[PDB]
From Swiss-Prot:
It comes from Mus musculus (Mouse). The lineage of its organism: Eukaryota, Metazoa, Chordata, Craniata, Vertebrata. It comes from the Eukaryota. Transforming growth factor beta-2: Homodimer; disulfide-linked. Transforming growth factor beta-2: Interacts with TGF-beta receptors (TGFBR1 and TGFBR2), leading to signal transduction. This is Transforming growth factor beta-2. It is found in: Secreted. The precursor proprotein is cleaved in the Golgi apparatus to form Transforming growth factor beta-2 (TGF-beta-2) and Latency-associated peptide (LAP) chains, which remain non-covalently linked, rendering TGF-beta-2 inactive. Transmembrane segments: none annotated. Disulfide bonds join 7-16, 15-54, 44-85, 48-87. Multifunctional protein that regulates various processes such as angiogenesis and heart development. Activation into mature form follows different steps: following cleavage of the proprotein in the Golgi apparatus, Latency-associated peptide (LAP) and Transforming growth factor beta-2 (TGF-beta-2) chains remain non-covalently linked rendering TGF-beta-2 inactive during storage in extracellular matrix.
Length: 88
């Protein structure tokens, strides 16, 4: 698939997964997530052979930490990480 294993290895103008690190506090303005400080969300871009767009395919969740007062709470966020792309 058009995932990290294939794309991050060989550069190409074609549709592929692209690295992208997001800092929750600094980029999104989020004060809610205390751990991790950020994560690799990645994204999709590139030439597609109608004329498709390079878009996400499979998504993965992210486990984070938020607070109710001072108390740490664990929670799985859905659709946070892009693991593969596709032409559609
Ligand atoms: Ca959840």
């Amino acid at each position: 698939a058009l995932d990290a294993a294939y794309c991050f290895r060989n550069v190409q103008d074609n549709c592929c997964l692209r690295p992208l690190y997001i800092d929750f506090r600094k980029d999104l303005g989020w004060k809610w997530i205390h751990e991790p400080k950020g994560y690799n969300a990645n994204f999709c871009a590139g030439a597609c052979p109608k004329s498709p767009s390079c878009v996400s395919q499979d998504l993965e969740p992210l486990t984070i930490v938020y607070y109710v007062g001072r108390k740490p709470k664990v929670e799985q966020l859905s659709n946070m990480i892009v693991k593969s792309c596709k032409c559609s």
